Amino acid sequence: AMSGPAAYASYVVRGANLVTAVSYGRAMRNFEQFMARIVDHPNALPSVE
Amino acid sequence: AMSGPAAYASYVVRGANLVTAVSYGRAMRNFEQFMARIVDHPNALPSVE
C-alpha cells in the first residue's frame, strides 16, 4: 500500500497569463512565481533548499 | 503667450512589462490598461469618453 495524490494538478491560464496569451502568441507557466524571481527580488543565486 | 506642459511624460518598463521584456522579448506600453480591459471588462465596447 502506497500513498499518492487523489486528483490531478490544475493549470489555468487565468490572470496575467491571459493578457500575454491574447496580446502575444505565448504564455508562461506560473507567471506569478516567475515574476517574484525577476522584479520582486533580483540578484539571488539559485539554491535548492 | 501659451500654456503647455513643463516636463516629458515618463514611460518606464515596470514589473509586469519587465517579465515579458526579459522572457519573451516583447514589451508593451501601459500593461495595466491592456489588463483592465481583457480580463476585467471583456465585453465593454470601445467608446470615446
Question: ∠ CA A41-A43-A45 to the nearest 5 degrees?
Answer: 105
Tell me if B15 sits within 8 A of A39, measured CB to CB.
yes
Instruction: Please give the resolution of this entry in Å, rounded to 1 decimal.
Output: 3.7
Q: Out of B18, B22, B38, whose CB is closest to A19?
A: B38
A–B CB contacts, 8 A cutoff, strictly below: 38
Q: Are A35 and B15 in contact (CB under 8 A)?
A: yes
Whole-angstrom distance, CA of residue A48 vs CA of residue B14: 28
Provide the residue type at A37 as one letter.
R
Q: What is the CA radius of gyration of chain A?
A: 16
Q: Which residue has the cell 502568441?
A: A25
Would you call B27 an interface residue with chain A, using a CB distance cutoff of 8 Å? no
Give the whole-angstrom CA distance, residue B34 versus residue B42.
11
CA dist., res. A10 & res. A29, Å (int): 11
Strands (E), A1-49: none
- The method of structure determination was cryo-EM
| Pick from B9, B30, B40: nearest CA to A18 | B40
Spatial CA neighbour of A22 closest among B16, B27, B39: B39
Q: With contacts defined as CB-CB under 8 Å, which chain B residues touch A22?
A: 38
